[PDB]
């Protein structure tokens, strides 16, 4: 009831043994009371890393998207080493979503070892199980066995109806995923551990489908973008290998489903000046001239009977002399060109009324005309060439024309393919203009360039008119164990890409959210524009170029920082070489680097003086010792992980306050939230995500099941809580309910439709779906439902919730009226009470631990001690946690070496990895999450608690208590001990 503290552990250790005399009775009682539970105490075990690789093919339908929507790929499994390194080999194949699927080394859902099908953004198929939301459901198949050598896996995806189906060795899999969220793009993915051998098959020249595709499905190889090339890549990464060594990589830019639809602007509806009947006629004449010259060059002749084979021009006149079906066509062509020009914000009209006289045409010899004879002289336009603004105008005109063509094609049912298949109504140019290659852009732009040149030659009046930040900003720092407090230090950073790098020195208290230089904590340099950043970007030196190196320099003896570039010291505006002066030591400084989206760069410390370039030029002879020169182990580093995780509300938050009054009469204990700065300056308002610090768990078996009746109090299984929403808070865009431990969504405009939920439907031998279980990450009442239940009412909105652990049905209520929002869950699942609020008032929400008639308050399910106590209580452990967008995480010392190549046109791309890699994972019972044991270096409280826990183990095992030793053998393993002894970090 009072959280995790080490004083009580010391008390227990004192209870165990004293005066060199062991109380076996007390030791056994303590053992019985805590060891079997395996809860409320940290647990450790050794696991294996998991790595996932995708085929770089993104497909997903939308409103007007060019994606075909029906796709099919195949996977060969050739070599499997089962139970390698005393652990079963992990191997899964499936699909994953572009947004929300961010696998990282370690730190998986529950215990470590996450992969495809362990998160609701991904779906995978095991040997005999179906994985989704970290839930394992065995699947009935004609052959039930794990992934073995020489195995064939076929995965097919349909977007028209949301279906994902699988087949093993020609035998269809009897379970499918349906009703999943179609937001984003889907890509094939395989997750694996050490000792695997897989081969991709996507059809076409690549690989070969050993089994025929299902009807209506298309191979995945034809979905590659025209400028894109097939190449395997990992899902996401923060580091890479290169010639110099470890090269850090920043955020990766990704496309969206909305990008795949063309978005043009209507132009024919716009009225035009009367210049169309004068100057646009002359432009049409010029178009006729140029087109006739193109035919002349091609060898086309003037034969009045139009015949393409015989090269005959129907008009057969030097003047185009085209009829209304032809002349009007070319006239409306030019008219639409002018309409597009005006719609781009440019002008349409005339601005010289005399430059057309200056135009003198280009006379050509008689060889151009033949047959009846057509030699329209090209009207010379060299008098006015195309400015860069004019070129941009042509580019936008071509973009608009391609977009209107593409919207027509998608309206009539055109789907893009890498190959061209007119009978199947599929062209490679169906991608948007900016997605087109340079050749198609040129073919859609050349004639428009000529038309704009006609405009210029005549001299017209045409003249030109939060979470994303976290995802696109990445920060790297050190272990904080090497916080230098004195001396002179040097470290180098090679900026491989010209993009925005920020490198410098920061204090140990750098918040991951705060960008480098925006606060006094970090003195940084950004050479994208070439300025030093501290409380603002002030000019300093010059920006670098791709491949340059920055020699960052610090002397705490003189309290200054110096930046050099390629051996040249950057020199400020005032004339001081030092970027900053009088830099107080404070709590020390650490190297820090921040990378932008689509950026790479190498961070070289002082570990390798030989590899340290330009050190002799600037760093050496000035007393600046290379940082961490004497270290034999690599300097462990920490990366600014962009992953929403719930953390307790800090008491120093300038805008939110938690009051926590309790013990009132006729009112149950409660926790109040208030807006400190509401109705004042700098009163930021944004979506807020809150939950309780502890969960409640359902029964392992779902075997049905005035003055309150005591017998009904004892028999009842339901638990109740309430929420008091004060006046002034928006009754919409608010949610109250229960979230899974792994649930996390930092959406700025969150909605109940934005929750992740997929229905796994289990077909039988007859094809009839059974066990249609809906895995959803959250279950709570919609804000529209709240406002419908019900200016904002002066009486506070009452939001009651009833959880039934025995049966699994979930009930909600608003202001004493049971809201229609209801749910059903699975046995052995735990949920957290969560409230999502859009603050719009000084007083917003107040969570409340209350009871009702014949209803047991939450505290009984929340704590085992009070399981039969009807009095509602709020122990100090129960606290409110807010969703933290960014948190710091430590980079693993070593990474798996996976080799991916293309064996050939038959075997496809082959992926193989055989290097084992293990680590010790520390699991939190209540949070259902795990972290690396080495991460506890910066987490002293958890480290202290775990150390006291080990001391308690020694105390209970002391003085030859062999039974207790055997009992502890389960919790602490021999392999874990040996790995701990051989551990160095």
């Amino acid at each position, epitope marked *: 009831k009072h959280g995790r503290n080490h004083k009580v552990l010391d008390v227990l250790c004192s209870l165990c043994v004293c005066n060199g005399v062991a109380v076996r009775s007390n030791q056994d009682l303590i053992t019985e009371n805590l060891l079997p539970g395996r809860e409320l105490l940290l647990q450790t075990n050794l696991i294996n890393y998991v790595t996932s690789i995708r085929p770089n093919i993104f497909v997903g339908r939308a409103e007007g998207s060019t994606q075909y929507g029906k796709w099919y790929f195949e996977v060969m499994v050739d070599e499997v080493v089962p139970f390698l390194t005393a652990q079963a080999t992990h191997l899964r194949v499936g699909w994953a979503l572009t947004e929300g699927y961010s696998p990282y080394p370690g730190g998986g859902e529950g215990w470590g070892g996450n992969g495809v099908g362990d998160d609701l953004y991904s779906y995978g198929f095991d040997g005999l199980h179906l994985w989704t939301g970290h839930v394992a459901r065995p699947v009935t198949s004609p052959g039930q066995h794990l992934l073995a050598p020489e195995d064939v896996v076929s995965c097919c995806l349909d977007l028209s109806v949301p279906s994902i189906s699988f087949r093993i060795n020609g035998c269809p899999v009897q379970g499918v995923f349906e009703a999943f969220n179609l937001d984003g793009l889907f890509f094939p993915v395989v997750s694996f551990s050490a000792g695997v051998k897989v081969r991709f098959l996507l059809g076409g020249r690549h690989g070969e489908f050993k089994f025929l595709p299902p009807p209506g499905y298309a191979p995945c190889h034809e979905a590659v973008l025209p400028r894109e090339r097939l190449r395997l890549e990992p899902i996401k990464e923060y580091r890479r290998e290169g010639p110099r060594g470890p090269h850090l990589v920043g955020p990766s830019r990704c496309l969206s489903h909305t990008d795949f639809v063309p978005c043009p602007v209507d132009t024919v509806q716009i009225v035009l000046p009367p210049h169309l009947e004068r100057i646009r006629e002359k432009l049409a004449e010029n178009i*006729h001239e140029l087109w006739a010259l193109t035919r002349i060059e091609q060898g086309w002749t003037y034969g009045p009977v139009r*015949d393409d084979n015989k090269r005959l021009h129907p008009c057969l006149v030097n003047f185009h002399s085209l009829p*209304e*079906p032809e002349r009007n*066509y070319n006239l409306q062509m030019s008219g639409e060109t002018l309409k597009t020009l005006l719609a781009l914000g440019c002008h349409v009209g005339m601005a010289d009324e005399k430059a057309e006289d200056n135009l003198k045409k280009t006379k050509l010899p008689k060889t151009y005309m033949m047959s009846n004879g057509y030699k329209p002289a090209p009207l010379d336009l060299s008098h006015v060439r195309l400015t860069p603004a004019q070129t941009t105008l042509v580019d936008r005109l071509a973009e608009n024309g391609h977009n209107v063509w593409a919207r027509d094609r998608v309206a*009539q049912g055109w789907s893009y393919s890498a190959v061209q298949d007119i009978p199947a109504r599929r062209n490679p*140019r169906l991608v948007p203009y900016r997605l087109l290659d340079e050749a198609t852009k040129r073919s*859609n732009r050349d004639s428009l360039c000529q038309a704009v040149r006609t405009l210029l030659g005549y001299g017209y009046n045409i003249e030109p008119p939060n979470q994303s930040r976290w995802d696109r900003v990445r920060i790297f720092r050190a272990e904080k164990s090497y916080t230098v407090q004195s001396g002179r230090w040097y470290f180098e950073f090679e900026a491989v890409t010209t993009g925005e790098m920020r490198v410098g020195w920061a204090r140990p208290e750098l918040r991951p959210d705060v960008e480098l230089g925006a606060d006094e904590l970090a003195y940084v340099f950004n050479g994208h524009r070439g300025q030093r950043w501290h409380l603002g970007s002030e000019p300093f030196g010059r920006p670098w170029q791709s491949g340059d190196v920055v020699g960052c320099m610090i002397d705490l003896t003189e309290n200054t920082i110096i930046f050099t570039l390629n051996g040249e010291v950057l020199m400020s505006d005032s004339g001081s070489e030092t970027a900053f002066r009088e830099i107080e030591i404070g709590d020390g400084f650490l190297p820090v680097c921040s990378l932008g989206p689509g950026q790479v760069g190498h961070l070289n410390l002082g570990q390798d003086v030989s590899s340290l370039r330009f050190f002799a030029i600037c760093g050496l002879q000035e007393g600046f010792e290379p940082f961490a020169i004497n270290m034999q182990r690599p300097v462990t580093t920490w990366f600014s992980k962009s992953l929403p995780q719930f953390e307790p509300v800090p008491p120093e938050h300038p805008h939110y306050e938690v009051a926590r009054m309790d013990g009132t009469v006729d009112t149950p204990p409660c926790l109040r939230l208030a807006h400190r700065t509401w109705g004042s300056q700098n009163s930021l308002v944004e979506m807020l995500f809150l939950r309780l610090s502890l969960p409640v768990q359902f029964h392992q078996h779902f075997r049905c099941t005035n003055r309150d009746d005591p017998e009904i109090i004892l028999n009842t299984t339901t638990y109740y809580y309430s929420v008091r929403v004060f006046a002034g808070q928006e009754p919409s865009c608010v949610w109250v309910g229960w979230v899974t431990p792994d649930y996390h969504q930092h959406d700025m405009n969150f909605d109940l439709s934005k929750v992740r939920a997929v229905t796994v439907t289990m077909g039988d031998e007859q094809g009839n779906v059974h066990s249609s279980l809906k895995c959803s990450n959250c279950y709570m009442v919609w804000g529209g439902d709240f406002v419908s239940p019900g200016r904002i009412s002066h009486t506070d909105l009452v939001i009651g919730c009833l959880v039934d652990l025995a049966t699994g049905l979930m009930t909600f209520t608003a202001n004493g009226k049971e809201s229609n929002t209801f749910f059903q869950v699975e046995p052995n699942t735990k949920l957290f009470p969560a409230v999502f609020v859009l603050p719009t008032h000084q007083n917003v929400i107040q969570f409340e631990l209350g009871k009702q008639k014949n209803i047991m308050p939450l505290s009984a399910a929340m704590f085992l001690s009070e399981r039969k106590n009807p009095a509602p209580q709020c122990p100090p452990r129960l606290e409110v946690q807010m969703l933290m967008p960014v948190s710091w995480s430590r980079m693993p010392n070593h990474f798996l070496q996976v080799e991916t190549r293309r064996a050939g046109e038959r075997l496809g791309w082959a992926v193989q990895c055989q290097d084992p890699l293990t680590m010790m994972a520390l699991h939190i019972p209540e949070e259902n999450r795990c972290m690396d044991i080495l991460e506890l270096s910066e987490r002293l409280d958890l480290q202290r608690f775990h150390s006291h826990t080990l001391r308690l183990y020694r105390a209970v095992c002391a003085l030859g208590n062999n039974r207790v030793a055997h009992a502890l053998c389960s919790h602490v393993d021999q392999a874990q001990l040996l790995h701990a002894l051989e551990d160095a970090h």
Partner: nanobody
Framework: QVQLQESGGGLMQAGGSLRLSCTAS????????MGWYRQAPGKQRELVAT???????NYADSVKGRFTISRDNAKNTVYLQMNSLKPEDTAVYYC?????????????????????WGQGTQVTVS
């Protein structure tokens, strides 16, 4: 958008008369030209003698026989008369409307791609 259909072209012996009407319902704009296409079973879809508004008829190498064509812009219908039937004339006939007039477009790939096909109808020669 522009939904088009061929009506007619049933099975008849050699020399049988076959009237295939072709009608496209849609926006009246960019409706100046169109043609007919011939695809033998398992073969390429070549071009039947095309016609454009203004009664401009253009022939090709697949016109050996009676390939009569006649268009009416008021009701926007085009009739193809297949009176000469030959063993090699058995094919699926499609009807395709396009903005490109007289088989030429001084614009390039966009307008060229600005075409509208039709469901078509199968014709077999006995």
């Amino acid at each position: 958008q522009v939904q088009l259909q061929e009506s007619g072209g049933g099975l008849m012996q050699a020399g049988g008369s076959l009237r295939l009407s072709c009608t496209a319902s849609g926006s009246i704009f960019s409706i100046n030209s169109m043609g007919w296409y011939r695809q033998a079973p398992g073969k390429q879809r070549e071009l039947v003698a095309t016609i454009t508004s203004g009664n401009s008829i253009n022939y090709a190498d697949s016109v050996k026989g009676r390939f009569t064509i006649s268009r009416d812009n008021a009701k926007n219908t085009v009739y193809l008369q297949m009176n000469s039937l030959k063993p090699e004339d058995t094919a699926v006939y499609y009807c395709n409307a396009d903005r490109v007039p007289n088989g030429y477009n001084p614009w390039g790939t966009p307008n060229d791609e600005y075409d509208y096909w039709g469901q078509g109808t199968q014709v077999t020669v006995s």
